Amino acid sequence: VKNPSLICAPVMADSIDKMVIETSKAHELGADLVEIRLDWLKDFNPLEDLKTIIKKSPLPTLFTYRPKWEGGQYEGDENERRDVLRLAMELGADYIDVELQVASEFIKSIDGKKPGKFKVIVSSHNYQNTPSVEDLDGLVARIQQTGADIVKIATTAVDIADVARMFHITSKAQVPTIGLVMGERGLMSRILCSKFGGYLTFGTLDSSKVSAPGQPTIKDLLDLYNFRRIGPDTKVYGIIGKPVSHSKSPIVHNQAFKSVDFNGVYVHLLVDNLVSFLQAYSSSDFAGFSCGIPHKEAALQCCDEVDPLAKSIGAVNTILRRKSDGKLLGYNTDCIGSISAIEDGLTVVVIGAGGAGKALAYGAKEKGAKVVIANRTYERELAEAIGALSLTDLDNYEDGMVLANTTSMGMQPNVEETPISKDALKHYALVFDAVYTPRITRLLREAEESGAITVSGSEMFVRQAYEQFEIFTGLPAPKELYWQIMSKYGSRENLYFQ
Numbered sequence: 001v002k003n004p005s006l007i008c009a010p011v012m013a014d015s016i017d018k019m020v021i022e023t024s025k026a027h028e029l030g031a032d033l034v035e036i037r038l039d040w041l042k043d044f045n046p047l048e049d050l051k052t053i054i055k056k057s058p059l060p061t062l063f064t065y066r067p068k069w070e071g072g073q074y075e076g077d078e079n080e081r082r083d084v085l086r087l088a089m090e091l092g093a094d095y096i097d098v099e100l101q102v103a104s105e106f107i108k109s110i111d112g113k114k115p116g117k118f119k120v121i122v123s124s125h126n127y128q129n130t131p132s133v134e135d136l137d138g139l140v141a142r143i144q145q146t147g148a149d150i151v152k153i154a155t156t157a158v159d160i161a162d163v164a165r166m167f168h169i170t171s172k173a174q175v176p177t178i179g180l181v182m183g184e185r186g187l188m189s190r191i192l193c194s195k196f197g198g199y200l201t202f203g204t205l206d207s208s209k210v211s212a213p214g215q216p217t218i219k220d221l222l223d224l225y226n227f228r229r230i231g232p233d234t235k236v237y238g239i240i241g242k243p244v245s246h247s248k249s250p251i252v253h254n255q256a257f258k259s260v261d262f263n264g265v266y267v268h269l270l271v272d273n274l275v276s277f278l279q280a281y282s283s284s285d286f287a288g289f290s291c292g293i294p295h296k297e298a299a300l301q302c303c304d305e306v307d308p309l310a311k312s313i314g315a316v317n318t319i320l321r322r323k324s325d326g327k328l329l330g331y332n333t334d335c336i337g338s339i340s341a342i343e344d345g346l347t348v349v350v351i352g353a354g355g356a357g358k359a360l361a362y363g364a365k366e367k368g369a370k371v372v373i374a375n376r377t378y379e380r381e382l383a384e385a386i387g388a389l390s391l392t393d394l395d396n397y398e399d400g401m402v403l404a405n406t407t408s409m410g411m412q413p414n415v416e417e418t419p420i421s422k423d424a425l426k427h428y429a430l431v432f433d434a435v436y437t438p439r440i441t442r443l444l445r446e447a448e449e450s451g452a453i454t455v456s457g458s459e460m461f462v463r464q465a466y467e468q469f470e471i472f473t474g475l476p477a478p479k480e481l482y483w484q485i486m487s488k489y490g491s492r493e494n495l496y497f498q
C-alpha cells in the first residue's frame, strides 16, 4: 500500500530540553519523523512543553501519551491524558497516537476540529502473540471503524513464521497501516516495510533508546539494511541460524548488493524450526538463504536438489530458490572457504562434527592429510565416513600439526571459552577457528602465544560469503570487494543485531 515506509525515531528523554536535542539528533541521523513519548517526561507542563517541542523539532511530530494499561508510563486521570493529545493536535502536531480502546470516544471529541495536515493514528499493541489472519483482519476493521486515519498494529513474535501474517496485512489492507512484530524473531518485520506496504517503522537513536523489543537503530536501517533501496520487487535473502544476532552476513551481502546495484536485501533469520520456516516463506519473495548452526544438516534434507559437493558432505550452508519452479537447491561453500583459508595459512584435528565440521573434515581428506575429528559427543561417525576422539580427551594428545575449531565455542558472548587447553597447543603448527565474532578468540590468542600459525575465521567467512553472493546473484564473485567490505564495515566487535 502506497508510499515507501517512513522511519520514525522514538523520543523518550525524561526532560523537555533533552527531548529537543533528541529530535535534532533524529534529524541528523536521517529519521523522517519523531514519536514524542510524552509518558516518559518526568515533569510535564503540557501547554508550554508541547509548544516548545513543536516549535523546535526539525522533524514532523507524532505525539504519544501512552497509559500504563497499554504498556506505557502514564498514570492518572484519563480525560487529562486526552486533553493533552487534543492540545498537541490544536498546537500543530503532525500526528497523534490514540489507543484503540478509547479511540471512538476520542475521535468523536475532535470531529470537525482537526487541522488540515493532521492525521490520527489509532494503535493496538499485542504483547502475547501474533494472531491469525482472521483475527488481524477483525482488528484492522475495528480500528478503521473508530475513524482512524492510519491503522497501527504491533504484535509479538513467538516464532519467526508469525511475521508473514503481518506482511500479508500491511501488503493488502486498503488503509495506511503501520504493522510491526516485536521481539528478535520479529525483527524482519521492521526492516522490510517498504517491500510489503508498511507505512512506518521505528528506528532508534542508538541501541540503548529502545521503545519496544527488536527495534534497530536508524543508522543500521539506512546504512546496513539499505532501507531506502527496499521496494516491492526487492528479493529477500538472509542468514538462517540460532543464534543469529552475531552474524555479519547482513553487513557484507547488503554492501555487495548495493555496490553492484542488485535488487536484493539480506536480513537476520532467527529460526527455531527449519521446516516450518521454509514452508512459511516459500514465495518468490524469498530468493535464497545462508544456513548456520544448527540448521546446516536439516537444510540438506529440506532441499529438493543438492549440489554434489554438498551431497557428499552431508550439509547445506547455501539455499537458492529457483525462480522456474520455486524449487530449493542446496550448495556448500563452507568447504572451499575453510580449506583455502587454511592452505593460505601455510594432519588435521577437527573440533566439532556439525555441518561446518563435516565440510572441513570432508575437504581435508580430499587434499593433503586425512585425519581425526573431535566432538562433544564422542561418537560423531565422520572419522569413519572420511578416514575419532572424545572432547574431554582432546587436550591429552606429533609437534607441528593443525587444529580446526568449527563449533560455537569462543563465540561472543563466550569470549573466555576455548575448545582446548593452552598447553595442548604446543603440539600444533596451525590453528584455525571458524568463529569470527570475536575476531581474536581465546583459542586464537593462546594459539599465537604458543607460537603457532593462526588463521582467523574471517578468512573463512569472507571466502564462503562471496561464493554465496555468486550463487545468490548469478554475478561473478567480487572477491576484492568483499575483503574491502569486511575490512571497512565488518571490523567492530560485540555487535548484536536483535
Ligand SMILES: O=C(O)C1=C[C@@H](O)[C@@H](O)[C@H](O)C1
Residues within 6 Å of the ligand: 239, 246, 247, 248, 249, 250, 290, 291, 292, 293, 317, 318, 334, 356, 464
Ligand atoms: O555467521 C554467518 O553469517 C555464517 C557463518 C557460517 O556458518 C556460514 O556457513 C554461513 O553461511 C554464514
